[PDB]
């Protein structure tokens, strides 16, 4: 029973770290969307200009 208990003890603290970290990462991808639109506009502009 002590063996079972020891696993759970360590988990309880450390999991909270991952919990935060995971959402933090997701936030970064939101910001990446703003980038994506910047990238997009540049690509489009270069293409129209290339045709000219």
């Amino acid at each position: 029973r002590i063996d079972s208990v020891s696993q759970l003890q360590n988990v309880a603290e450390t999991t909270k770290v991952l919990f935060d970290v995971s959402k933090e990462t997701v936030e970064l991808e939101s910001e990446a969307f703003e980038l994506k639109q910047k990238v997009e506009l540049a690509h489009e502009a270069k293409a129209v200009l290339d045709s000219w």
Partner: protein, 171 residues
């Protein structure tokens, strides 16, 4: 960088192996990894925001459209506005998670010391060379309850007794 978050993530993934509670939790981490890996290659792919008005305008000899698209790009240079939506959901999630985490932590910490104490109790107290059934009747009224229930039932062979203790007979 992003790799710090992810180094803790994958260390935690191979720790998450050691929790069988996961179902789609590992799939959520996998998903955050996917799009995280997408944004870094997006960011590495990135074109310079505007066309070169130095080189790439002086190439064109039809130029009256390079000023148009130069100014149009630099006008609409914000191409998307910011999103911070993780400040309402992350705190809510963090509250339930924190509560549950702390509950688990305190519960198992208590249990560890309870088991430690119980382990000590078996070592430091155990009559077993002179144990009296009176002491067991005192430690559990289950003893008398079962004896009485057996007399009431009218079975004077208690099953299991001879399956881990002997018995003898002449017949």
């Amino acid at each position: 960088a992003k790799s710090a978050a992810n180094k803790l993530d994958w260390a935690k993934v191979i720790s998450s192996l050691r929790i069988t509670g996961s179902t789609a939790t590992q799939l959520s981490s996998f998903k955050k990894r996917n799009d995280e890996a997408r944004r870094q290659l997006l960011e590495l792919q990135s074109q310079p925001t505007e066309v070169d008005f130095s080189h790439y305008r002086s190439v064109l000899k039809n130029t009256s459209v390079i000023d148009k698209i130069e100014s149009y790009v630099k006008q609409y240079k914000p191409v998307k506005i910011d999103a911070s939506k993780q400040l309402q959901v992350i705190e809510s999630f963090e509250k339930h998670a924190m509560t549950n985490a702390k509950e688990t932590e305190s519960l198992v910490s208590k249990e560890l010391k309870d088991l430690q104490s119980t382990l000590d109790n078996i070592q430091s107290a155990r009559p077993f060379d002179e144990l009296t059934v009176d002491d067991l009747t005192k430690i559990k009224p289950e003893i008398d309850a079962k004896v009485e229930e057996m007399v009431k039932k009218g079975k004077w062979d208690v099953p299991g007794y001879k399956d881990r203790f002997g018995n003898l007979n002449v017949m």
